[PDB]
């Protein structure tokens, strides 16, 4: 009997090698004696190479291995919403088991060329410095890239929290994160109520390399279940660099020759296969969509490194966060020089597209003028364009933590800035101006807010100026 039973020959460093299993198939789940699962990676002539998905300390040479008959799979369903699970679907928060009744394979083909539709629906992140000049549409995949301690996790958490009104399911996948950090993130989600529609998949730095390698595929396979039902899903991968490091460790343990920077040859194929499943399905396929926000941690802002360039070569844009800006008070840390959205703009509401279209390039020009003007003095119009506009734009794009702003409240203040109603008040007062203008609008322009909400356009050609001046009358300098 060797068809469905095997025997371990070698154990070490999280990988094993088994004799027998003549009728196993490539990528099949196998179950060891301890209950620890594995995956059949290589089908050699006399043995099978198995990657161990769990604690390998309890596995010894001579232990029995048996088939399961299933290609690598994860449980899916609505019973998974509001739970914290490992990449194998095992519940981790301790709130009892999970009652899912369906499964999907880890590896699945991506939607075809004719299965997709152009992105045309906005994803409102609730952050001005994103929704204004780097818009994100549904079905897009946008890269978030920056150094450590820059707010990458905060951006994703704010985006996830802002989705409460919208009909969207959120999946937060943490790869290599600290368990205390994951616990605190889960607590913020619980406090803000996002656990009504959120699934959290975790694989901490203490877990063996295969689980870190495997987590994003489990997340996207969980997302596809809702995507193919005609729903909208958002998936956040907290690090793809740590997944790449785990895969490099696995490859070197398997003795595959390394390429550039010791990474294996298919380090590009890994990420492309993962990120190509995010798509905007058409009306024939149901109209569902999946949105991806992969993370990449750079070293000293080197955007030209191998992994950052590989990930840039896949996604539909990137949002670059700068540590130099994050320190010294520019807390959202958006860098308009290196941030762009290739698919966005066609998925932006008409009012915001009508108002804040030129802000990205105007702010980049202001940034260049900021270094140029350090050489001395300049023209009166140069000083105007610099100090009146750019400083106020920078000070109004700044935003506090976990404080989303509705898109209408964003477009009002952006219009007020771009039409010159802010040019007079001091730079050190515009944040108070915005904070009180939101309350003033809530009190007196609810019909303008409804106009924007319903028709997705500016409330009127000129009518807003009367209310803006009415607020300016009651507002006080300093």
């Amino acid at each position: 009997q060797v068809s469905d039973v095997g025997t371990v020959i070698q154990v070490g460093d999280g990988i094993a090698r088994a004799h027998g299993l003549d009728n196993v198939m490539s990528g099949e789940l196998v179950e060891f004696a301890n209950g620890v699962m594995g995956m059949a990676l290589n089908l050699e002539e006399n043995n099978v190479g198995i990657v161990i998905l769990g604690p390998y300390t309890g596995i010894k040479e001579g232990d029995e291995v048996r088939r399961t008959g299933r290609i690598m799979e994860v449980p899916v369903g609505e019973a998974l919403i509001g739970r914290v699970v490992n990449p194998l679907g095992q519940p981790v928060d301790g709130l009892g088991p999970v009652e899912t009744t369906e499964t999907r394979p880890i590896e699945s083909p991506a939607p075809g060329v004719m299965d997709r539709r152009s992105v045309h629906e906005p994803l409102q992140t609730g952050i001005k410095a994103i929704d204004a000049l780097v818009p994100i549409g549904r079905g897009q995949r946008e890269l978030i890239i920056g150094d450590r301690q820059t707010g990458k996790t905060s951006v994703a958490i704010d985006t996830i929290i802002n989705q409460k009104d919208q009909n969207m399911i959120s999946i937060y996948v943490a790869i290599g994160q600290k368990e205390s950090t994951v616990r605190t993130v889960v607590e913020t989600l619980r406090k803000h109520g996002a656990l009504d529609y959120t699934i959290v998949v975790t694989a901490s730095a203490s877990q063996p390399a295969p689980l870190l390698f495997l987590a994003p595929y489990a997340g996207v396979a969980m997302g596809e279940y809702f995507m193919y039902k005609g729903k909208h899903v958002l998936v956040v991968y907290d690090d793809l660099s740590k997944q790449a490091a785990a895969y490099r460790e696995l490859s070197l343990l398997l003795r595959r020759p390394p390429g550039r920077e010791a990474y294996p040859g298919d380090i590009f194929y890994l990420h492309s296969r993962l990120l190509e499943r995010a798509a905007k399905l058409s009306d024939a396929k149901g109209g569902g969509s999946l949105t991806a926000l992969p993370f990449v941690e750079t070293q000293a802002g080197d955007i030209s490194a191998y992994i950052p360039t590989n990930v840039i070569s896949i996604t539909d844009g990137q949002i670059f966060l700068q540590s130099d800006l994050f320190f010294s008070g520019v807390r959202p840390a958006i860098n308009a020089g290196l941030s762009v959205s290739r698919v966005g703009g066609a998925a932006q509401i008409k009012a915001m597209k009508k108002v804040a279209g030129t802000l990205r390039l105007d702010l980049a020009a202001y940034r260049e003028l900021e270094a140029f003007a350090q050489f001395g003095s300049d023209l009166d119009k140069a000083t105007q364009a610099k100090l009146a506009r750019g400083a106020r734009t920078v000070e109004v794009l700044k935003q506090d933590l976990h404080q989303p702003i509705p898109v209408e409240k964003q477009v009002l203040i952006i219009y007020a800035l771009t039409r010159g109603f802010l040019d007079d008040i001091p730079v050190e007062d515009v944040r108070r101006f915005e904070k009180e203008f939101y309350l003033f609008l809530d009190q007196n322009g609810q019909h303008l807010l409804e106009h924007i909400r319903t028709t997705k356009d500016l409330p009127n050609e000129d009518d807003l100026n009367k209310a803006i001046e009415a607020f300016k009358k009651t507002f006080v300098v300093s």
Partner: protein, 470 residues
């Protein structure tokens, strides 16, 4: 059976063959004991750690000492568990060697003492604490500008002769006094004379009665240098898991742990990673660091010194280590020579805790205002040499006047600094230091002489010093 025989000896790597169906588990401990039967042999006493299962009932191990004198065919005994070190009250004031065996001459530890395994999975997601908490050290600079977190990791940096050792001793003293906890010091791959000096300094300061020490220094094999950190951590974990205390853990140099791991991997024969490091660098660092966490009943917080090769902060080892750090305190030879103690740089130090959500709006505002004042003074120090002291504006004069008193009030008198200065130490609560710094900011004490702030505890002691001076 539970008996094997040696079949290969290649430096620190030893291969052992066992009976089929009786192989030991990974990370188990094996003992070799031998008596020289004749003149062509030597007495052997050795401990081995299992690392792989090579197949054919053969197990590859890593020795914890020198493998000289081994002979193909010697009997090996299985202990059935990983390395186990004594834990509890008996470990306080004692020095160990990574095997749990004492080094000082106070005698051996009885065989009825409880011993815990070295290797252990990290605490579950359920058992962690849900809220972030601040560890009150009682030192004004740290408690104001770079707070510590229960369960957090702190990186320590500084040149030679600036005050790192005295600062560590004062941290242990303050924690033991106020929070009722203990400390564990784990040297890793450092100078034996430095370890002896540290032992003598701790004995002189009287801190030694509240701390345990494990050294495993530079001359030890890579197998021992790779597990000193784990044995120190497992003696630290006992007090948090069983007595619910708040514990400090000092790692002398975390870089030597990675270097020893790389050396061990090269002997195991794995394929070298990017810059010659082991392929398992991130996994080993995670398995070490993730056990230092705050739980529902206690916490362990670790102060770690990190050597950076060639001052390149993008090197893989510092890059991996920095991802785990929660705060950073930098020492300044300029402050040390100026006479400011504990000489912590108030601008180079960074901390994740200093946020309004965690520390409070009042504390955050006071701290940020202090940092802005110090930055403005730093800028004005250039203009002083460019133009002259009198040429500066009146508001700049006020800024300088505030900045001198702030920079002097950052200093403090340490309990362990009594042996040098002759003055007793002070434990300053965080609320009191926040109030004092607010008062200095608001101009309530602009009339006092700036030297009365020099080296002092609370703010009331400052006005007492000014009253005694004039």
């Amino acid at each position: 059976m539970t008996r094997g025989r040696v079949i290969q000896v290649m430096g620190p790597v030893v291969d052992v063959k066992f009976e089929n169906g009786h192989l030991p588990a990974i990370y188990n401990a094996l003992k070799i004991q031998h008596k020289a039967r004749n003149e062509n042999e030597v007495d052997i006493d050795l401990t081995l750690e299992v690392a792989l299962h090579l197949g054919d009932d053969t197990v590859r191990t890593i020795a914890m000492a020198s493998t000289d004198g081994l002979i193909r065919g010697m009997e090996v005994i299985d202990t059935g568990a990983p390395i186990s070190v004594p834990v509890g009250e008996v470990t306080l004031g004692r020095v160990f060697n990574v095997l749990g065996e004492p080094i000082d001459l106070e005698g051996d530890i009885p065989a009825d003492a409880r011993r815990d395994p070295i290797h252990r999975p990290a605490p579950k997601f359920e058992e962690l604490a849900t809220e972030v908490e601040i560890l009150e050290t009682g030192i004004k600079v740290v408690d104001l500008l770079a707070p510590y977190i229960k369960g957090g990791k702190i990186g320590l940096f500084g040149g030679a002769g600036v005050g790192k050792t005295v600062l560590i001793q004062e941290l242990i003293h303050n924690i033991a006094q106020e929070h009722g906890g203990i400390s564990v010091f784990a040297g890793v791959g450092e100078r034996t004379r430095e370890g002896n000096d540290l032992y003598h300094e701790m004995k002189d300061s009287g801190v030694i009665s509240k701390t345990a020490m494990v050294f495993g220094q530079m001359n030890e094999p890579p197998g021992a240098r790779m597990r000193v950190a784990l044995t120190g951590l497992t003696m630290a974990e006992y007090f948090r898991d069983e007595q619910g205390q708040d514990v400090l853990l000092f790692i002398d140099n975390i870089f030597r742990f990675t270097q020893a791991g790389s050396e061990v991997s090269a002997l195991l024969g794995r394929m070298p990673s990017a810059v010659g490091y082991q392929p398992t660098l991130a996994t080993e660092m995670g398995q070490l660091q993730e056990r230092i966490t705050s739980t529902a009943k206690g916490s362990i917080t670790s102060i770690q010194a990190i050597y950076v090769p060639a001052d390149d902060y993008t090197d893989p080892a510092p890059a991996t280590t920095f991802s785990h750090l929660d705060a950073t305190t930098n020492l300044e030879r300029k402050l040390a020579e100026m006479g400011i103690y504990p000489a912590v740089d108030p601008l180079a130090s960074t901390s994740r805790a200093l946020a309004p959500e965690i520390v409070g709006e009042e504390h955050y505002q006071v701290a940020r205002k202090v940092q802005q004042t110090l930055q403005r003074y730093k800028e004005l120090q250039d203009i002083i040499a460019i133009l002259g002291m009198d040429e500066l504006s009146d508001e700049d004069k006020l800024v300088v006047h505030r900045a001198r008193r702030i920079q002097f009030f950052l200093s403090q008198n340490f309990h362990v600094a009594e042996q040098f200065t002759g003055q007793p130490g002070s434990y300053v609560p965080v609320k009191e230091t926040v109030r004092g710094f607010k008062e200095i900011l608001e101009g309530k004490y602009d009339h006092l002489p700036e030297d009365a702030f020099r080296l002092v505890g609370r703010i009331e002691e400052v006005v007492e010093k000014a009253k005694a001076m004039g």
